[PDB]
Amino acid sequence: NFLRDRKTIARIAETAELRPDLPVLEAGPGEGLLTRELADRARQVTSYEIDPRLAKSLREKLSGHPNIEVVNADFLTAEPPPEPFAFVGAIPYGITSAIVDWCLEAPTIETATMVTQLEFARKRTGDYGRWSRLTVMTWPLFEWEFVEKVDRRLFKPVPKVDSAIMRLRRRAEPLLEGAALERYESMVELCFTGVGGNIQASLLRKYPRRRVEAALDHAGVGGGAVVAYVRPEQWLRLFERLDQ
């Protein structure tokens, strides 16, 4: 699926929050129009194309841009650069979670701007109230933002479902660090298993009743809340009170 709509392509490039001293890594470059717009704004673009024939034609198509390099390789086995950078990608359906993990694990990444299936982006950004476990776990380190829906008819060939632009931003200052962050991650893990039936019952496996009740109230969360509908700001408040 190749995005052809010029307005959406420009929206992606502007979403990436690029600047002249920041390099970009790109995956799923397709026709390379987006690559041109990224190269206009960033220090340089390194664009990954796994297919050797497509890599060669893309390299020639973009040879009028000296700050574009095309790498004939699988992006998923690429190492991130040891300097701040941004990722931009149009991600096929079957490797979306793996690309997200690639970005979450790159310690110098600033932003990751991705075109994904619509439902994937909504879950990972809580756009309709339901929250991914990974989003909650990484919220102290990353912002997850839903940018916009992208209608199927803007691609070629036209797919079956709609897409979306979503963005990760690595926070300049993490909301938690060190052992406190680990204690937060342990709390989130504990609650997403569902042991005991409800979030209150799960928390009671690790924390005293008096403190659990105080923490739920502090966070504005009911003892029987559906775990997936607790918001990240509520998880932080819950941990704040529990960790005293």
DSSP the chain: -EE--HHHHHHHHHHT---TT-EEEEE--TTSHHHHHHHTTSSEEEEE--SHHHHHHHHHHTTT-TTEEEE-S-GGGPPPPSS-EEEEEE--GGGHHHHHHHHHH-TTEEEEEEEEEHHHHHHHHTTTS---HHHHHHTTTEEEEEEEEE-GGGEES--SS-EEEEEEEE-SS-SS-HHHHHHHHHHHHHHHHTTTSSHHHHHHTTS-HHHHHHHHHHHT--TT--GGGS-HHHHHHHHHHHT-
Closest Cα to residue 168, out of 148, 139, 191, 208? Answer: 139
Cα 104 to Cα 174: distance, rounded to the nearest angstrom: 13
**203: exposed, middle or buried (C-beta count within 10 Å: 0-12, 13-18, 19+)?**
buried
Q: Which residues are annotated as a binding site?
A: 1, 3, 28, 49, 74, 90
* SS3 labels along 164-196: EEEEEEECCCCCCCHHHHHHHHHHHHHHHHCCC
Q: Which residue has the tokens 């699926």?
A: 1
Closest Cα to residue 81, out of 48, 38, 36, 58? Answer: 48
Could you state, in order of their start, the residue ranges of all structural domains in the chain? Answer: 1-177, 178-244
C-alpha distances out from residue 55 to 31, 47, 60, 70, 103, Å:
10, 9, 9, 7, 23
Cα 235 to Cα 86: distance, rounded to the nearest angstrom: 28
Handedness of CA 83, 147, 33, 71 (dihedral sign): positive
Instruction: Give the N- to C-terminal CA distance of the chain in Å, as an integer.
Output: 50
Q: Which residues are annotated as a binding site for S-adenosyl-L-methionine?
A: 1, 3, 28, 49, 74, 90
Method: X-ray
Whether the CB-CB separation of 230 and 131 falls below 8 Å is answered with yes
Edge-to-edge order in the sheet of strand 109-117? 68-71, 44-48, 23-27, 85-90, 109-117, 163-170, 142-150
**57: exposed, middle or buried (C-beta count within 10 Å: 0-12, 13-18, 19+)?**
middle
Residues facing residue 232 across a β-bridge: none
Residues facing residue 198 across a β-bridge: none
What number of other Cβ atoms are within 10 A of residue 244's Cβ?
A: 9
Cα 177 to Cα 13: distance, rounded to the nearest angstrom: 31
Whether the CB-CB separation of 102 and 76 falls below 8 Å is answered with yes
Closest Cα to residue 192, out of 233, 240, 149, 229? Answer: 229
Q: Which tokens belong to 78?
A: 């690429």
Whether the CB-CB separation of 31 and 10 falls below 8 Å is answered with no
Phi/psi for 25 (5° steps) reads: -105, 135
Phi/psi for 231 (5° steps) reads: -85, 155
